[PDB]
Amino acid sequence: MYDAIVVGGGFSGLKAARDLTNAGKKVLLLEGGERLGGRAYSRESRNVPGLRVEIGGAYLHRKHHPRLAAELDRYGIPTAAASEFTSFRHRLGPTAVDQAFPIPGSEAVAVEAATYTLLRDAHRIDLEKGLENQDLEDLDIPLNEYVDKLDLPPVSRQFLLAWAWNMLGQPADQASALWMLQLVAAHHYSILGVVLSLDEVFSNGSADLVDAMSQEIPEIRLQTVVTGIDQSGDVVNVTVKDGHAFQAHSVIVATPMNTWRRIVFTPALPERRRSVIEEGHGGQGLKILIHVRGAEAGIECVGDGIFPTLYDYCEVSESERLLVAFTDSGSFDPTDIGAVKDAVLYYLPEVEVLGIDYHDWIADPLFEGPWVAPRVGQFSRVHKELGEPAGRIHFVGSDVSLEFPGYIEGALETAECAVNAILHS
Amino acid sequence: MYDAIVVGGGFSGLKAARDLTNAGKKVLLLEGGERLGGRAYSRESRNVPGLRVEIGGAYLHRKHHPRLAAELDRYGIPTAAASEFTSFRHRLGPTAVDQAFPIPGSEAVAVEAATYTLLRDAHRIDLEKGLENQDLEDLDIPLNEYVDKLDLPPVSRQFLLAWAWNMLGQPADQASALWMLQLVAAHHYSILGVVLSLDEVFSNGSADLVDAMSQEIPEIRLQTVVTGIDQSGDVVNVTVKDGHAFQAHSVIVATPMNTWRRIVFTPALPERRRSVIEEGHGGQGLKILIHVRGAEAGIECVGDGIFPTLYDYCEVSESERLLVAFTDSGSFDPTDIGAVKDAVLYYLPEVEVLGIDYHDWIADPLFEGPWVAPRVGQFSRVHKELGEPAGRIHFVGSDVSLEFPGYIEGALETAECAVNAILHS
Ligand SMILES: CC(=O)NC(=O)NCN(CC[C@H](C)[C@H](C)CCN)C[C@H](O)[C@H](O)[C@H](O)COP(=O)(O)OP(=O)(O)OC[C@H]1O[C@@H](n2cnc3c(N)ncnc32)[C@H](O)[C@@H]1O
Ligand SMILES: CC(=O)NC(=O)NCN(CC[C@H](C)[C@H](C)CCN)C[C@H](O)[C@H](O)[C@H](O)COP(=O)(O)OP(=O)(O)OC[C@H]1O[C@@H](n2cnc3c(N)ncnc32)[C@H](O)[C@@H]1O
Ligand SMILES: CN1CCC[C@@H]1c1ccc(O)nc1
Ligand SMILES: CN1CCC[C@@H]1c1ccc(O)nc1
């Protein structure tokens, strides 16, 4: 038996297992898959032999992400500025200007006023209380309705919606306006900063930091899928698909929220959590790496396309690159290459699509989704509680971070909190 | 004896005398000077023979100024777009960009946050209540201190200060942050709109509208300076520098606030008004028309110069123009041509100064100031009351408008209110 079993070897599990180990606890980490890192996944390109790509979560910003910065510094992990955009190819209508902030002067007054409203609304959110504890239900409505109320002129309207579609991984009618405001709050109450935090990347992929952390974790079992967590006895019993159980005084659930429903908890989890757990969050973000020819470096495109965003990802050769597109898997089928071409050509009619690469997070039984975003009405009902302990079982991860949900920083933050709680007892 | 004596033949007096006349009242208008229009003054250039210039208040915006628009439409008075700026020559430091909104991307987040603060603060102001009636005293502090608290990076810092110096006619340490916020409030709670309302000009000078209104006023006496207003008897007695008194049931004071102290009121005005009346407002705006050679059309300059603003005013010839500079008469002496050259050359080192033209509003006994701006601490003590009747004596004018102080629209608005009040009784 162990002091702690950690379930899941994403960044959160890795942090928690390492820091409990360095505190002198006896820890076991169980990861269901054949790799560590979770929704941070670097691997070989499907399109380009020998090419290392981030298929999951690539970007960071030192200022917004101090725990991640500290990890990078601890292990001397090299980062680089994300590809600068030097060419803008928006689809926002004839008055938009082709630069990173494409709003024309004729919209300036409207943007001013909307800026006040958006930040006013976001300033209602105290990031420590939980979205269900602040009388925020009036904001917890479909984004398209909230945006219709701002009544914005065309360029800024579509610019906001496009970026919200990219960032939330939901179309406007499925996204919560409240969750959009939570992301604003999380970035030091900044609309701009939501996009500005795409600031740096791992020079060698997020695996660099995965490997550094794992090297400090003495006991890790891969291909070990947890199926039951039973705290009915004096010591927690952890049951596993094809093997003998493991026991520990404490268990950390560091798996994705949308998989918790596949674990049997004994006794059953607090009733208020159960239906959100059963339903899952609604995020459907779909990131597609597009292998292309005929694109010059430094392109960014934002617009009204089925791809709200399409931007430079990496050089492959002198004539070839990867672009990245964001959309959502409810609205777009990435295996339909014809559809991919149409979506690309919309912005960039000179560009030839060679290939696509993505991971199906939704179909992956170890995830059942990409990054977190709640369905409308979910998080103003129950939110903070999803990341709070039930007896000796802690719940951690990006999915349940109050402070930086959906980012690596949030995986670190939630782990930090579970670790401290365990150290006190 | 008359139903009403109107004192002062600026726009406010003109409106009030005309509309009381058209209502069937018997009205007399007394103007101390040799001309009508007041602080709206078109005349011949001192520098350029035969050239008609606006030496006072030139600009209007139909959307912000519906009473003025209605006057223009009533009389079919032609307006034109103000000179478009096509060339930007700012002094805001090496990161500023040379366009109308000179803020660089590296300041975007700071501007976002300041935008929220400024509009939050301005949204505390209800334009109908008076600045003294809303618990606003905490904002009624020196602008430089308020701005230091926003802690803005250099370009937006200086851009804000420069425009505030231009618009208020006071240096930052004499201006009230509260009054800056009042101008924001007045423009539909818009910082941008403060500058955007410089939108159109009278094609033939503001005299066009002065003349149209005056033609409807059957009795006007020029060179008739009022010295006393005595409502001790049943009928008001109006006493005059070199002449016999005039009598009326009602008197409208439509003279500038800083001259009211030169009139003897009987009985004395309500005590709360008296000290602001004695002291006068603090506006020192100084508009200088600069005759130049070597400037191309369409220049705007905003910066840290003794002229915060310097911009195109009119074509004189193919090689010559008028520019306009705004500063304040406490900080700058316009008759020092050497100083003018230095101030111009700062922004535009290729430009030769031929001549300057201005009106000394401060020295003019019929004004004792340019447009209104309060001293720090004045208007959170007494404001709305300055424009309220004392018995049968009404007080009107731009100076005391709650809604558009310092603009023609505010002259019209205050007159409208006195007129209605008189018509009811
Ligand atoms: C994007 C960006 O640019 N920047 C970012 O900051 N973030 C990127 N991003 C999203 C990536 C997107 C999908 C998107 C397409 C790409 C974005 N670009 C947000 C952020 O990166 C992630 O949401 C974040 O790093 C989450 O970390 P944690 O919070 O630690 O959970 P997770 O990683 O999921 O590891 C769970 C482990 O449980 C294992 N497991 C499951 N069931 C199990 C069982 N029963 N038994 C045992 N093990 C089990 C399962 O095998 C797995 O190994
Ligand atoms: C600028 C802009 O672009 N746009 C603008 O909208 N506005 C421009 N602007 C300011 C112009 C600036 C100074 C600046 C340099 C230039 C701006 N650019 C604000 C706005 O234009 C003015 O502040 C506004 O139009 C004020 O109208 P009212 O409110 O009607 O007062 P006023 O006109 O002063 O007529 C008082 C009459 O009493 C007579 N009087 C005095 N004492 C007497 C006495 N005892 N007995 C009898 N008469 C007497 C005295 O002879 C005079 O005829
Ligand atoms: C909001 N996030 C967190 C995970 C994926 C993601 C993301 C990353 C880049 C981009 O352009 N948009 C969204
Ligand atoms: C604020 N006002 C009202 C009267 C003068 C004035 C003004 C006009 C133009 C400009 O650039 N700045 C100030």
UniProtKB/Swiss-Prot annotation, chains A, B:
Cofactor comment: Binds 1 FAD per subunit.
Keywords linked to the UniProt accession: Alkaloid metabolism, Cytoplasm, FAD, Flavoprotein, Nucleotide-binding, Oxidoreductase, Plasmid
Regulation: induction: Induced in the presence of L-nicotine and D-nicotine. Expressed during logarithmic growth and stationary phase.
Entry's Gene Ontology cellular component terms: cytoplasm
GO biological process: alkaloid metabolic process; nicotine catabolic process
Binding site for FAD: 12, 31, 38-39, 56-59, 226, 398, 406-408
Binding site for (S)-6-hydroxynicotine: 166, 311, 326, 371, 407
Catalytic activity: (S)-6-hydroxynicotine + O2 + H2O = 6-hydroxypseudooxynicotine + H2O2; (S)-6-hydroxynicotine + O2 = 6-hydroxy-N-methylmyosmine + H2O2
Protein's cellular compartments: Cytoplasm
pH dependence: Fairly stable between pH 6 and 9.
Family matches, as InterPro entries: Amino_oxidase, FAD/NAD-bd_sf, Flavin_amine_oxidase, Flavin_MAO
Job of this protein: Involved in the degradation of L-nicotine. Catalyzes the oxidation of (S)-6-hydroxynicotine (6-hydroxy-L-nicotine) to 6-hydroxypseudooxynicotine. Oxidation of the pyrrolidine ring of (S)-6-hydroxynicotine leads to the formation of the optically inactive 6-hydroxy-N-methylmyosmine, which hydrolyzes spontaneously to 6-hydroxypseudooxynicotine. Acts with absolute stereospecificity on the L-form of 6-hydroxynicotine. Can also use (S)-6-hydroxynornicotine.
Record-stated family: Belongs to the flavin monoamine oxidase family.
PANTHER family: AMINE OXIDASE, AMINE OXIDASE [FLAVIN-CONTAINING] B
UniProt-recorded name of the protein: (S)-6-hydroxynicotine oxidase
Organism from which the protein derives: Paenarthrobacter nicotinovorans (Arthrobacter nicotinovorans)
Gene that produces this protein: 6-hlno
